[PDB]
Structure formats: C-alpha cells, structure tokens
Amino acid sequence: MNNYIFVLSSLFLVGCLGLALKPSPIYGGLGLIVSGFVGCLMVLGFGGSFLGLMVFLIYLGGMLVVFGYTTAMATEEYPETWGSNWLILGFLVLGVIMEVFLICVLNYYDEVGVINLDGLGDWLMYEVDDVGVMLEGGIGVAAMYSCATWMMVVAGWSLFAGIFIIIEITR
Amino acid sequence: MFFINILTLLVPILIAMAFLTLVERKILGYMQLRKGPNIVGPYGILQPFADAMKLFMKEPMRPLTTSMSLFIIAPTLSLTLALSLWVPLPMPHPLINLNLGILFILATSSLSVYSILWSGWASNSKYSLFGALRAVAQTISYEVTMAIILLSVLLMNGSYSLQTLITTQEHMWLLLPAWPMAMMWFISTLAETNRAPFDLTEGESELVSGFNVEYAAGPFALFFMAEYTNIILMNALTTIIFLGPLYYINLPELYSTNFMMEALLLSSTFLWIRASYPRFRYDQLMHLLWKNFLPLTLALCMWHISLPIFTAGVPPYM
Amino acid sequence: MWFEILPGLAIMGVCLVIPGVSTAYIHKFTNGGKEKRVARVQYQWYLMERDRRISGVNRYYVSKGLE
Amino acid sequence: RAEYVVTKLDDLINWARRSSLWPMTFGLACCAVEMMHMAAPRYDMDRFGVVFRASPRQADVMIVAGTLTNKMAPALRKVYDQMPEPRYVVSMGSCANGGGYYHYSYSVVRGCDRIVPVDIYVPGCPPTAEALLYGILQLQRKIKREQKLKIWYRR
Amino acid sequence: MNLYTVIFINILLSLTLILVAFWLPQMNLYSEKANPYECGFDPTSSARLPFSMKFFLVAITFLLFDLEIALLLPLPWAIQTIKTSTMMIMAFILVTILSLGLAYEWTQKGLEWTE
Amino acid sequence: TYKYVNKKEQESEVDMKSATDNAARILMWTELIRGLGMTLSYLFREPATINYPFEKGPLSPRFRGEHALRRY
Amino acid sequence: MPSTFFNLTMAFSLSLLGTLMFRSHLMSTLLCLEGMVLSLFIMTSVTSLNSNSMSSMPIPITILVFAACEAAVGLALLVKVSNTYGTDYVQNLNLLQC
Amino acid sequence: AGRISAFLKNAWAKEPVLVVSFSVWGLAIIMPMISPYTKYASMINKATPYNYPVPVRDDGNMPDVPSHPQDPLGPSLDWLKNL
Ligand SMILES: CCCCCCCCCCCCCCCCCC(=O)OC[C@H](COP(=O)(O)OCCN)OC(=O)CCCCCCCCCCCCCCCCC
Ligand SMILES: CCCCCCCCCCCCCCCCCC(=O)OC[C@H](COP(=O)(O)OCCN)OC(=O)CCCCCCCCCCCCCCCCC
Numbered sequence A: 001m002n003n004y005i006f007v008l009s010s011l012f013l014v015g016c017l018g019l020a021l022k023p024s025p026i027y028g029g030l031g032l033i034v035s036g037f038v039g040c041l042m043v044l045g046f047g048g049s050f051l052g053l054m055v056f057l058i059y060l061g062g063m064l065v066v067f068g069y070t071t072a073m074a075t076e077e078y079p080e081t082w083g084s085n086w087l088i089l090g091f092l093v094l095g096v097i098m099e100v101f102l103i104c105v106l107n108y109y110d111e112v113g114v115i116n117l118d119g120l121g122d123w124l125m126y127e128v129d130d131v132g133v134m135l136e137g138g139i140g141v142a143a144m145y146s147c148a149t150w151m152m153v154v155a156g157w158s159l160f161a162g163i164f165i166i167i168e169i170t171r
Numbered sequence B: 001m002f003f004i005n006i007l008t009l010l011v012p013i014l015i016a017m018a019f020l021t022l023v024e025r026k027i028l029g030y031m032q033l034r035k036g037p038n039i040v041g042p043y044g045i046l047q048p049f050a051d052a053m054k055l056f057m058k059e060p061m062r063p064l065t066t067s068m069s070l071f072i073i074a075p076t077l078s079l080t081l082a083l084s085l086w087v088p089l090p091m092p093h094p095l096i097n098l099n100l101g102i103l104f105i106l107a108t109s110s111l112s113v114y115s116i117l118w119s120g121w122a123s124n125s126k127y128s129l130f131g132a133l134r135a136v137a138q139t140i141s142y143e144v145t146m147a148i149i150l151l152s153v154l155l156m157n158g159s160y161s162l163q164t165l166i167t168t169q170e171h172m173w174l175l176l177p178a179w180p181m182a183m184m185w186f187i188s189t190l191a192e193t194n195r196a197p198f199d200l201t202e203g204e205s206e207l208v209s210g211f212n213v214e215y216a217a218g219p220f221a222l223f224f225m226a227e228y229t230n231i232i233l234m235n236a237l238t239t240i241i242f243l244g245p246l247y248y249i250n251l252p253e254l255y256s257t258n259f260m261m262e263a264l265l266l267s268s269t270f271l272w273i274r275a276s277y278p279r280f281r282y283d284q285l286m287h288l289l290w291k292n293f294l295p296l297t298l299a300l301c302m303w304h305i306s307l308p309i310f311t312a313g314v315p316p317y318m
Numbered sequence C: 001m002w003f004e005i006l007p008g009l010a011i012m013g014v015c016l017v018i019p020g021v022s023t024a025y026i027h028k029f030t031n032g033g034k035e036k037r038v039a040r041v042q043y044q045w046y047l048m049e050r051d052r053r054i055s056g057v058n059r060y061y062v063s064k065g066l067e
Numbered sequence D: 001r002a003e004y005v006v007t008k009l010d011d012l013i014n015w016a017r018r019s020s021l022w023p024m025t026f027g028l029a030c031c032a033v034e035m036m037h038m039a040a041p042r043y044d045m046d047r048f049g050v051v052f053r054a055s056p057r058q059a060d061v062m063i064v065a066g067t068l069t070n071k072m073a074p075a076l077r078k079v080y081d082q083m084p085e086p087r088y089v090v091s092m093g094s095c096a097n098g099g100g101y102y103h104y105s106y107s108v109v110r111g112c113d114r115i116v117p118v119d120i121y122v123p124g125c126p127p128t129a130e131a132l133l134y135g136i137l138q139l140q141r142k143i144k145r146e147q148k149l150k151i152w153y154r155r
Numbered sequence E: 001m002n003l004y005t006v007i008f009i010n011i012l013l014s015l016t017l018i019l020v021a022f023w024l025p026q027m028n029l030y031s032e033k034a035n036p037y038e039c040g041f042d043p044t045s046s047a048r049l050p051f052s053m054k055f056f057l058v059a060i061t062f063l064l065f066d067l068e069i070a071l072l073l074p075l076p077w078a079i080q081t082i083k084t085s086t087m088m089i090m091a092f093i094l095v096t097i098l099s100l101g102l103a104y105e106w107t108q109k110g111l112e113w114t115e
Numbered sequence F: 001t002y003k004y005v006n007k008k009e010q011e012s013e014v015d016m017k018s019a020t021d022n023a024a025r026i027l028m029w030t031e032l033i034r035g036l037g038m039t040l041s042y043l044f045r046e047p048a049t050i051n052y053p054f055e056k057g058p059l060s061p062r063f064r065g066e067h068a069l070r071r072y
Numbered sequence G: 001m002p003s004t005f006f007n008l009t010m011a012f013s014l015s016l017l018g019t020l021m022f023r024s025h026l027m028s029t030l031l032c033l034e035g036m037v038l039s040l041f042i043m044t045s046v047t048s049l050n051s052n053s054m055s056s057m058p059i060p061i062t063i064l065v066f067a068a069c070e071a072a073v074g075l076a077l078l079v080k081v082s083n084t085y086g087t088d089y090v091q092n093l094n095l096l097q098c
Numbered sequence H: 001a002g003r004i005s006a007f008l009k010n011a012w013a014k015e016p017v018l019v020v021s022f023s024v025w026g027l028a029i030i031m032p033m034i035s036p037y038t039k040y041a042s043m044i045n046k047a048t049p050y051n052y053p054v055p056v057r058d059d060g061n062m063p064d065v066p067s068h069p070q071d072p073l074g075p076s077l078d079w080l081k082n083l
C-alpha cells in the first residue's frame, strides 16, 4: 500500500525505457498506451480523476493513428523489436538492473532525500482538504472559461490553424 | 461479501450473452421464415453450451507467421474490457460508483479497438490487416461523436456519474429533450460494437472473418463473448441516459425490472437491423459521420449550452 | 411460431435483474440495512470517517441515546 | 467407476461437436445451390446448429460440392489443411464422389477422396437439399459413435 | 482497492479460460495449417508491407479534435461558475472556429479518400 | 416495347410542401423504417421449415433417385 | 512526491536519450517524443495537485493541445517522406549537405 | 426575395442537415439575448454557498443583517422560490 506509487512510477519509467530503445512503432505505441494508463494511475493516486483519464483518452485516439500510418510508412518486412536481437535485450535488462542499482545506491546517501525507501509512502498528499467540497480537478481545468480564458483562445487557435497547417503539408 | 457480488454480476452476463447468440439466431430466423435452434434443448435454450463447449476442444491455431504474444493478449483484452464495463453500470446502486463513471466507459470503450488492431496485426494475413485498418477509420469516425453526443446530454446533467441520471430522469425520459442525440447515439452505439448493419471489420463477404480469421476456436470465443457482451452495454446505457425507468426508492427492483424491459428491446432492436440493412462500403461511414452527424452534433452541442443559460436549467454538482 | 423466442428472452430476462437487485441486497447486508453511502466529495468522506469514530469501527450505526 | 464416467464424457463431448458443427462456405458448382436450399426456410441448417462460417479456422466440416478440378485441388487441400483436426468432410454430388460426368476428362479429379479423406458421401447429381440433410445428420451420428476417451482409458 | 478486486478477476477469468483452451484440445500442429490463409493459395507477398492508406488526412483531423473534445469536457463544471457569460461566449467561439476549420477542409477536399 | 426504370428527373420547382416531404425522409431516415416494419411483418408469420425426419417434404411420382431392377 | 519526480525526470531523460539516438526510423523518434511530453504532463499535474494549485490546472491541457498539434505536423511530413522514398528511413535523407 | 429565399428551398430539400446546423448555430447565440430568464443563470449560480460565509465583526457600522440568520435584512432570495 505504502509501496503503491513507487511501483506505478517504476513501471512507468520502464514503459518509457523500452519506448526509448525504439522497437517497431507498434511495440513503442504499446509501450505508451501502457505508460499512459500508468500515468492515469499516479495522477489519480494524488487526487484528480479527470486529468488521468484525459491522457488515457487522447493517447488512445492518438496511438490509433500511430497504428495506421506505421502500417503505411514505418514498417519493415520484419519488425525485429525486442525478442529479435541482443543489442536491445541487454540494454532492456541492464537498464532495469541499473534502476534497482541506482535507487538502492542513493538510499545509502540518505541526505538529499531523493528516495527514502524507509520513509516511503508517508509523504504523498500533504494536508489536502479533509472537511471540504467543490475541490476536485476539472474545477481548475474549467477556468478556461473564467479567469483563465487566454489558455482557451490560444489553444483553440492552434487547432483552428492546425487544420490549415496540416493540409498544406499534404497537398 | 464482495466477491459474491461480482459472482452475481459476471455469471448473469456471460449466461445472458450466451442466450443472445441464440436470440440473434431465432429472431433473425423468423424474419427469414425459418425456425432457429429447436432441438439441442427445448427451444434452442441449450445451443450456446454446445457452441461454447465445442470451441474449447478444437486446436487453437498457433499460426506459423504471427506474434504469439499479442495473439493471445487481444481476446484477453477484449473479454476483459467489455465485461469490465459493467462495473459502474448503475442498476440503481452500482457495484462501483464513480464520479467520472462515463469517461471510464469512453476510454475503456476505446481499448476494445486495440483488441482488434493488435490481433490482425499480429496475425500475418491480408484479410486481417484490413479488418484492423477497417476499425481505425471507424473509431476515427464515431469517437468524435460518442463524446459530444454524450457530453451535450451530460451538459444538462451535471457530474459524469451515471448515478445522477436516475435523479435527472426522476419525472421524465431524456429521449424527449434529446431525440437527435439519441438517434446519432444509437448509430454510435452501433459503430462501436462493430456488430452492425455496417460491420466492415468481421466482413464475412469481403474480408472473410476479418481481424478474426487466423484465430481458431479457443481464442475465437473471447470476441463473441466480448462483442455480444458489449451489445448489451450500449443498449443498457440508452436505458439509463435516454430511457429513464422508475426509481421510487422503496422498491429498487422496479428500476431493474423496467431496465430489463427496455434493454431487451434495444438489444432486440439491433436484431432487426442486421436482418434489414447492408453495409456502408467503409468510405460512406466516414462521409456519413463527419459530414451529416458531426455538424448536426456541434449544433445541438451548442444548443444545450444555450439551453440552460437561456432559461435557468443548470445541473447541480452534488 | 414466434412465441418460441420468449424462452431465449425470459431466461435472458431472469439474468439482468440479478446484478441490479443483488447489488442492493448485498449492500444492505454489508451496510446495515442502509445503502452503500457513496462519497463523491471530501465532505461525505469526512462524515463517514467521523461516524467510523463514534462507534465500533463499522460506521453504519450509533446515533442518539448517548448524551 | 472410471469407464462409465469416460463413456458418458465421450458421449457428452460429442454432443457439442455434432450439434454445433460449423460447415464452410464452399461452392464450385450446381450442387452448392442445394446447400442454399438447405439454408432456406424449408430444411433449415440453423435449426440443427449448423452455421455457415466462411473461414476454415472457424470451421468443423468441409462440404465438397462440385467438380474438384486439378487447378482447384491445391486450394481444396490447402483449405482442409487449415482447420483444427476434429475436422470432418462431406462430399456432395457425383462430381465430387467420383467425378460422375467428367470422370474421363483431363481437368477433373476422379473424386474428392483422391485428395482429402472423407467421413461421408452424399450421392445425387444435385442431391436433394433433403439428401445432404440426411448426410449431415448421418455425419452427426458418425461421430456420436466415436470413442476418443474410451480408447484412451484402455491404452 | 475495491476495483482491483473486480478486475484482477476478469484477467484471471480470461487467463484461466485461455490456459484451458491450449492445454485441453488435443492438437496436431504440423506445417500447412499454421501457414497463412489467403483463400486456398500460397500468399504472393509477405503480409507486412506498406498498406498506403487513403484517409491519412482525416486521421489527423481526428488527432486534432480528440484534443478539442478533451477541451470541451470541463463544460459540466464551467456552468457552475458565477460568470456564465464568458463561458457562454467562449463556448460559442470554440465550437464555431471548429466548424469553420471543419468547413474549410470540407470544401478543400480533405475528407475525400485521395484516388 | 421498352420501359424506362430509372427516369423521372424533372425540376418542377419543388414547393415547400415537397421539401419537408423530402427533408423528413432525411433527418428521420423513414424510408428505412418502412423496411424495419417489413421484417417485423415476418417474425409473426409461420416459418415454413419442417421437422425433416418426421416431416419429409413433398415429391411426385417421377422423382428419380436410387436405381433398382424391377421384376415380373 | 519526491520519489516519482526523480523517477519521472529519469523517464523524461531516457526519452531524451532515445530521441537523440535513432534506429533507422523517423516515426519511432516522433513516437519517442510523445512519451517525453507525457512525463511533463504528469510531473506538472502532481505539482499542481499536491500544492492544490487549481489555478494552474488549466496548464496540463494547454501543454497537451500542443502535444498532438506538434505530432500532427510531425506525422504529416512522413507522408511527404514516404511519397519520395516509400520506406521512412532516416538514413535516406542526406541530400542537403551538398 | 426570390433569388435568395428560394435557394433555401432546395437546400432544405437536398442538403437538409447544414440548414439545421447553420440555423441552430444562428439560433443558439440569439436566444439568450432576447430572454427574460437569462439574468438568473449568473444569480442562481451565485447563491450556492459552497464555501463558508465568514462573518464580519460588529464595529458600530453596516446596518445589514444582524447576528441572526432569519432577520429580514440581507440577500433573502425569494426569487428562486416562486420562480
Ligand atoms: C490483458 C491486458 C490487460 C491490461 C489492461 C487492463 C485494462 C483495464 C481497464 C482500464 C481501466 C480504465 C481506467 C480506470 C481509471 C480509474 C477510473 C476512475 O477514475 O475512478 C477510480 C476510482 C476513484 O475515482 P472517483 O470515484 O471518481 O473518486 C471519487 C471517489 N469515489 O477508484 C479508484 O481510485 C481506483 C483506480 C485504480 C483502478 C485501476 C485498475 C487497474 C487494473 C490493473 C491493470 C493491470 C493488470 C494487472 C497485471 C496483470 C498482468 C497483465
Ligand atoms: C424549438 C426550437 C429549438 C429546437 C432545436 C432542435 C431543432 C430540431 C433538430 C432536428 C434534428 C433532426 C434529427 C437529427 C438526426 C438526423 C441525422 C441525419 O440527418 O442522418 C442523415 C443520414 C443520411 O445522410 P446522407 O449521406 O445525405 O444520405 C442521403 C443521400 N441521398 O442518414 C443515415 O444515413 C442514417 C442511416 C442509419 C440507419 C441505421 C438504422 C437505425 C435503427 C433505428 C433504431 C430504432 C430505435 C430508435 C432508438 C433511439 C435511441 C433511443
């Protein structure tokens, strides 16, 4: 329980590690739908249920296109991804041993407090709201329409122009 | 005492789905002037057990040209999700109430795609690559609308919690305020849940058993167990979001009892469709749904924004 | 005739009432004859975790009669 | 007792395979027309748990209607060698059993049985749709009387 | 925690149902039923070549709108602001420029399946 | 003698009554509803199927099947 | 909170370590560029969600409207890399140094 | 007119979708400007006491609501009732 988010966090670092080794874009895309899901857990492990689901709505319909084009532009006769060579599988297993190494190194140097495996799980929320109402996220994201209505025009204009910026690149 | 609730939540939907395989063969039959199953049981009540027990004895094809890891995970991922969407689905009081209990549906509804993409991509075959690609431009088509047809309804409701609509519908069905939404929702409940008049993905006649052709019996059932399990959700939602049955909280089994009466119609309404209409050729479906529904959606999306502020009808955040 | 369809429906029709009517009677048994008492906000959780602390650790009980 | 349990399991294992057998969307000649009239509202397959699925991986029996030419023959055993192997076969017609007409032509195999092994043979030039239906009811008991767990116990 | 009790199950209900599908059929896998299908012939090409789609531009307009959809989703809470006149306007401004962005593409032959 | 099958196009300056007549065919897609009621007209019919081994369909005295050698 | 951000900063870096070492695909580098964004979404949300800085909660979406609009322009160039070559290999575009 | 008003007649016969969209668009922004009840949306939404109303301290001033809630002074919304 106390070791909840350190697990969700290290399974994210790994979901972004194999993502960095650059297998075929499918098993990288799979490597991001996972880490995007895992991102919905820790964002939600610290409160707001909205923001986590968003990543887990964008980068589903995001990676649904990444499945489409890779079948048309980015794909070999043989994908040759993870269980296909030993150059990736070494630096996929020695990245994880480097992880268990490194985090276990600097709990010995428990002076900067970058990780405190003994003082773990006890510092995650920091005095939230206990008696309270109308506090969740989505009240903040809805400031696009009150008191932060410039985040709104500036991002809407990007999508108004993306629709024109994109076709002149195809044409 | 919670496992005894899941046990009474998953058994009574895998045992229902099974008899939708039957009911999808008889109702279609009598329209075709042909009796369906009559023999294995009294009136075909015992045919899916044969069909089920038949499929877990045949050789699950491990094809020579494939990716045996994603091969096995897609049906694990299909039967998981569409079964796991029943968790917050509120017959009056749900197993798991959620504030964002409908974004849970949308997001997990989208992961039912990757069971169709990873399958046909893993399985080396032209007739399955297509069915994978046939879902890509299908999700691209409706998923813009399964949100806004679902937002603008939940815009004159408040929170995304599905439980609130039982109180929004305490005296009226939302079908009457939003029949335009309910029309396009019905078709968007029909593209998602690829079972359809426009199937386009398991096309027996074009793409024979698309996304599904290299799969033999063992893994094969987990899609039928997932597709016919998902037919009942997206009608069960229409019996919550648009057709609001009776709450009256001293007999909560009146909700669940009228929830039955409409969900079977909307589950029996899909059955008239497959026996009544052909497919959209896969270029119309995205010309039928970015051109005709998408503008008409944004309009009513805009109308229901200026519906309460025009009048007063602001949903409360309880 | 068409009446041979009703078994496929009215056996499917004694199969989707259970997850609705079982979901309540299983709550009332666990929650003490009350409803599950869902908590959407941080206030309704405080009342629980208060009422959890005015009794034995189960929170579906004691009220007036005390002082 | 063990044998009695295994005979009933082997009688109960077959009830599924024989009721819900999914034939395969074959064709090739006139004979296939009668299969449609066996999908028709007179002699319904679906009433017998018999369903057209147009892929072998989903199939449980091949129904060979029509002249099995020499060009089609690789495509007939490339297909029979794509099912799982409770797979069964049915040879509709006299063009598929022996090549009735065209027994002496050069581009016709003189029997489906030259190539794929067969469980049952339906005769008739166009066998009546109530004569495949007698065959796929007879194939439906030809593996009611298979003993695949019995001969495992005594082995 | 209560949901992990629901969903680890459904993996097991799937994972326990798949192990009883590979280890209880009595298989006979040799060579020619494992190899791919293409309707009774040996496939010409290798099944994993460039597909060259034709809806390439619409997939991007979706890729832009899934943001825009996400950029709508806080409206059920935005109406519970005290202003409800910038939320009024700025909700019209977002939906309008979208349809303008959608109508420009609609005329300039974006969603038309290049061919 | 020949008969045109698809030839009716003639712009009669369609009055606003003939527009809704067309604009409610669309926006309620009702031409299809005339098909759903058409299949609803058949589940309530008697399915023509027959229990085969107990109800073997009709033949005629010239139906030629299995050969046989008659005898005086 | 001070166990993930070292673990998320270290997840940004591996993706920065990935989108500088290529492997013969332009479309796996664009792909590695979105998980780069993603660690900044989360390492921005939490900071805006343990501090209860709801006023900054509009930011983790504005960051992300430019995560797909940049990918959109990114994906659309592959259409114009493919239509020259049809292969999408980064080693195939070297005729500018001339 | 005729050269504009009768163009809408085919656009209502054929293309009978954009007419609704372009209408409901133009019919959405226009109605709150001619309403009797649009004033209340920023008022029914301003009455909700989500946060606690901090009381001031009496310093011989502000003849407002005294130290008594049911006292006729102050924002007594009888408009929400009897709307
Ligand atoms: C075969 C491959 C399978 C792998 C993929 C499986 C996909 C599963 C389906 C995806 C889930 C969709 C996203 C869920 C997000 C959580 C939904 C949510 O927002 O509500 C969570 C809820 C708290 O939210 P809320 O209720 O609104 O707060 C107020 C308090 N009532 O209550 C909570 O806080 C609970 C939140 C955590 C629940 C997450 C469930 C994770 C399940 C484990 C997945 C990994 C599988 C295990 C490993 C097996 C190996 C494969
Ligand atoms: C008072 C002032 C304020 C008022 C504001 C409100 C203004 C009024 C708004 C009116 C809205 C009208 C209805 C909106 C939906 C209409 C959608 C539509 O127009 O669909 C058109 C589409 C055809 O498009 P097109 O490509 O042009 O084809 C014709 C080519 N010759 O048609 C199609 O292609 C769809 C075909 C799909 C058919 C599938 C079968 C569906 C099965 C039906 C299930 C029946 C039960 C219904 C259940 C409903 C859900 C509860």
Ligand code: SF4
Pocket (backbone or CB within 6 Å): D029, D030, D031, D065, D066, D067, D092, D093, D094, D095, D096, D100, D101, D124, D125, D126, D127
């Ligand atoms: S046996 Fe007769 S009906 Fe059958 S394929 Fe040959 S000619 Fe045609």
